[PDB]
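Internal ticket #5521
Category: modeling
Description: The requester needs a full-assembly model to guide mutagenesis choices. All entity lines are attached below as received. Residue total reported by intake: 221.
Assigned to: D.W.
Attached entities:
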Amino acid sequence: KLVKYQELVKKLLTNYASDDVSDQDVEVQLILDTERNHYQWMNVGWQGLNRIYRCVIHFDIKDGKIWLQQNLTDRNPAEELVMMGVPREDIVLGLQAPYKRQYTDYGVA
Amino acid sequence: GMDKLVKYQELVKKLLTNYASDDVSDQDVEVQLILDTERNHYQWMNVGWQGLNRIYRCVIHFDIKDGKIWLQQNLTDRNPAEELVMMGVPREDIVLGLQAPYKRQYTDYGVA
Ligand SMILES: [Cl-]
Ligand SMILES: [Cl-]
Ligand SMILES: [Cl-]
Ligand SMILES: [Cl-]
């Protein structure tokens, strides 16, 4: 499932990054590391004297599962992946405390 | 050109790998080396849990944009910009992205 899950995570993150309307002073970054399987959508820049430096969504792929590590949106990218064909057991909520995961409807490592 | 881009890619990856191999984090915290050589984004992050406390932080981040190395984040008490210089990177080809735009032309380094 590695190639399949790489393609799905890349597609979702690309959708979000391509739809991000941050102004000219904030760079929208898409970060795809296919060797260590770390995938991110970032905002990096400035609004006046305020530093904007934030990962909006982060997914890893580790041992056959997709790990959601960060979600700053009001949306549910884990369910979006499900809606796109990833079974819930193959999603790990990394951004949730480990002890909770076996009681969630998603997977464990 | 291309020799200069690859030079800078290698130097950034070597420094970050250097930085990350000195990590002191717990076994419950991963050290992530996030290296995108197609889009030229390079990070060292710590990702995990300390008890019920979420660890999610980028210790250093470099981009390479139009052939210049941008330092975007540095939570260490090291000076990665100076290290790159000591490694052969011209000052003028380093941009302090972590400094406000208006200041960059007045730093020791460079601008876009
Ligand atoms: Cl900027
Ligand atoms: Cl890694
Ligand atoms: Cl951070
Ligand atoms: Cl600049």
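Resolution: model delivered.
Comment from assignee: Chain A is about 20% helix and 40% strand.
Ticket closed.
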